[PDB]
Write a protein that binds this ligand. Structure first.
Ligand SMILES: Nc1ncnc2c1ncn2[C@@H]1O[C@H](COP(=O)(O)OP(=O)(O)O)[C@@H](O)[C@H]1O
Ligand SMILES: [Mg+2]
Lengths: 394, 300
């Protein structure tokens, strides 16, 4: 809250999850999946006691998914469905969530980098015409991550549910020519896990079963460390088989899949994506920077996003980077490798770094009038008010 | 199936189909079917020079030279009549059926066309049956190269016919199981009061193979049948020829079914060991009753 009583809300609006709260807070006040469901009848499910409205949104639309057809309003960071997104935002600022009068509040929104501009333009238009907010700012995600960590230099590897992006920043100066954006994240990993499980005889073909497979990938799956050793474990031993109880009651068994579904981040060719993994992409991003910044970029690799919470992802990333550095910088001199100093900063609450950075930035800039895009500027200019941020649109 | 059969199924099927198509009055269609059989035999049913009215069935054997000897075509001629024609280039025997001059009862000629290999073998083999029936001692004794590394030494005397199989298997597992399957082959004469004298040897070759070029070695087994005039008479020589012809293939067949037999006993013992392991899993105190599918019970 600023000196005018106008609450300063911070809303992350992720492809796979909304994390909303107030400025200066230390934890997101509400974290709920971003999906909108509509009631349907199914010949295999029977419920007759829980009141199901004609439109469930967010948390209740996920816990009650057995009796709904759910769909995400976002995808790859690009809003595919605008009506469902407006419903999700009505629910976010509604009574059974953050309860605010949007006529007298400021909001801090985010957006991935290298995203179509019509998306941000329409989001600002919606925020100024539908909810009629008194102030809107659209910050960069890596900048917010470096705000939350408390740094001014580092290469943010932000891998959310919808999209992975690597953004380096040096001494506070953004290098926008090194921003890389790989389109593999939690959702593609979930789809790959669905494929692998279908190889075992389980069929998850409905809209609700996607959340079941998501909750499986979150509990069981993990990123391997020495993929040859993990394959030897999966092919020779039987210590990787683990059982999971679906909501209906069925018991499925997940084995080698545990380390094959999240491997599609380091070996994209498994899911028919022609490129390089997140480790090789990080190394190429670094080695594309000037010589005088590489040595500091190697020491401040900041992980963020939920999809980097796989057990053993920091260590595997570090091992991959060390191998790449040994082969392609030292050209094979093992003696010098012990001098190479990486530091993959994986904070414990790295699943909400963007929100914490937004909270810090809003707590800093709540009481200014040259930072926020004011509603009057919108009514006067239109979608040109975005030029305040540094993104030039006419 | 215990005993291997002597008639080929593809020949019978193809010729019966062609004869049904011709007898109904339909126009004949092209045919070009090449295939194989046991002992490296190669069949080819085709048309001579694109003539869709004639069907020529040719066969290439491994006893190439023994069938060209004088008198080795008496049985083939006798059984096939005018169907026997000159061999097709690259093959050894060739029948030629004209789809417009087919006699009635088309079942007999097809039943005798499916046994082309058996008849080529019995034609080069009844020579010694006759050499023994006519009461002549010291008649010609030869070595039929019925395979490429194994041989069948046939000899005809005044009172007997000796057949010595020199046999060897290709795979190591097959060799190890074949040693047993051939050692235990003299224990068969306890199943019938009239069975030819069978002798097995793998230490040294018999004294019949010391003037001849039958395959010998330290990895080969020798199985000697002594067919007496109660197994080679003019009434029970068909069965004898069938058995002496399909003996090696039958032994190979049953060697390869012995493994699929043993696998069942191994699965049984695996389950029996799993039941001994099961004593280590502590019995649960309460189990949730599920459905045929595996979902929660949904009721008491
Ligand atoms: N502990 C975990 N391990 C692996 N994957 C996870 C984990 N937690 C979340 N995810 C995946 O990442 C997504 C959540 O990440 P998040 O950063 O909240 O995405 P968003 O970009 O929507 O904010 C989920 O949809 C899920 O598929
Ligand atoms: Mg995010």
């Amino acid at each position: 809250m600023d000196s005018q009583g106008r609450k300063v809300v911070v809303c992350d609006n992720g492809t796979g999850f909304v994390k909303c709260g107030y400025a200066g807070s230390n934890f997101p006040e509400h974290i709920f999946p971003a999906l909108v469901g509509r009631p349907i009848i199914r010949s295999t499910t029977k419920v007759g006691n829980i009141e199901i409205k004609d439109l469930m949104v967010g948390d209740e639309a996920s816990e009650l998914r057995s009796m709904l057809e759910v769909n995400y309003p976002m995808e790859n960071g690009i809003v595919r469905n605008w009506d469902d997104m407006k419903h999700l935002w009505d629910y976010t600022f509604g009574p059974e969530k953050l309860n605010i009068d949007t006529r007298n509040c400021k909001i801090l929104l985010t957006e991935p980098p290298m995203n179509p501009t019509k998306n941000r333009e329409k989001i600002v238009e919606v925020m100024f015409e539908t909810y009629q907010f008194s102030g809107v700012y659209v910050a960069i995600q890596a900048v917010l991550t470096l705000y939350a960590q408390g740094l001014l230099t580092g290469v943010v590897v932000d891998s959310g549910d919808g999209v992975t992006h690597i953004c380096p920043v040096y001494e506070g100066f953004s290098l926008p020519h090194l921003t890389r954006r790989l389109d593999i994240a939690g959702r593609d990993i979930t789809r790959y896990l669905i494929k692998l499980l279908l190889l075992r005889g389980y069929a998850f073909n409905h809209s609700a079963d996607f959340e079941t497979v998501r909750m499986i990938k979150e509990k069981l799956c993990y990123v391997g460390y020495n993929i040859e050793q993990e394959q030897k474990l999966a092919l020779e031993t039987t210590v990787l088989v683990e059982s999971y109880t679906l909501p209906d009651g069925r018991i499925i068994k997940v084995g080698g899949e545990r380390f094959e579904a999240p491997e599609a981040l380091f070996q994209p060719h498994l899911i028919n994506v022609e490129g390089v993994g997140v480790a090789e992409l990080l190394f190429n991003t670094i080695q594309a920077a000037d010589i005088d910044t590489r040595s500091e970029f190697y020491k401040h690799i900041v992980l963020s996003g939920g999809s980097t919470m796989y057990p053993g992802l920091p260590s595997r990333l570090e091992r991959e980077l060390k191998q790449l550095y040994l082969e392609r910088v030292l050209k094979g001199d093992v003696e010098k490798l012990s001098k190479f100093k990486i530091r993959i900063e994986d904070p414990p609450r790295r699943k909400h770094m963007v929100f914490l950075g937004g909270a810090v930035l809003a707590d800093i800039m709540k009481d200014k009038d040259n930072f926020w895009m004011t509603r009057q500027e919108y009514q006067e200019k239109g979608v040109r008010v975005l030029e305040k941020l540094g993104v030039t649109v006419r | 199936m215990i005993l291997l059969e002597v008639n080929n199924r593809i020949i019978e099927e193809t010729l019966a189909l062609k004869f049904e198509n011709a007898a109904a009055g339909n126009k004949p269609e092209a045919v070009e079917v090449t295939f194989a059989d046991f002992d490296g035999v190669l069949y080819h049913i085709s048309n001579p020079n694109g003539d869709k009215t004639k069907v020529m069935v040719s066969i290439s054997l491994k006893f190439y030279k023994e069938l060209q000897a004088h008198g080795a075509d008496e049985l083939l001629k006798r059984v096939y009549g005018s169907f026997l024609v000159n061999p097709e280039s690259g093959y050894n025997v060739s029948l030629l059926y004209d789809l417009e001059n087919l006699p009635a009862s088309k079942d007999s000629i097809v039943h005798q066309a499916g046994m082309l290999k058996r008849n080529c073998f019995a034609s080069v083999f009844e020579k010694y049956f006759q050499f023994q029936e006519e009461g002549k001692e010291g008649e010609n004794r030869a070595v039929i190269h019925y395979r490429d590394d194994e041989t069948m030494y046939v000899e005809s005397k005044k009172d007997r016919v000796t057949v010595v199989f020199s046999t060897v298997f290709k795979d190591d597992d097959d060799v190890v199981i074949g040693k047993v399957f051939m050692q235990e082959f003299k224990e068969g004469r306890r199943a019938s009061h009239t069975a030819p004298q069978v002798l097995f040897s793998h230490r040294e070759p018999p004294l019949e193979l010391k003037d001849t070029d039958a395959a010998v070695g330290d990895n080969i087994g020798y199985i000697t049948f002594v067919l007496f005039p109660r197994h080679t008479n003019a009434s029970a020589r068909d069965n004898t020829i069938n058995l002496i012809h399909t003996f090696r293939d039958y032994l190979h067949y049953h060697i390869k079914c012995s493994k699929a037999y043993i696998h069942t006993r191994m699965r049984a013992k695996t389950s029996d060991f799993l039941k001994v392991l099961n004593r280590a899993r502590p019995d649960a105190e309460k189990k949730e009753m599920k459905t045929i599918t595996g979902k929660t019970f949904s009721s008491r």
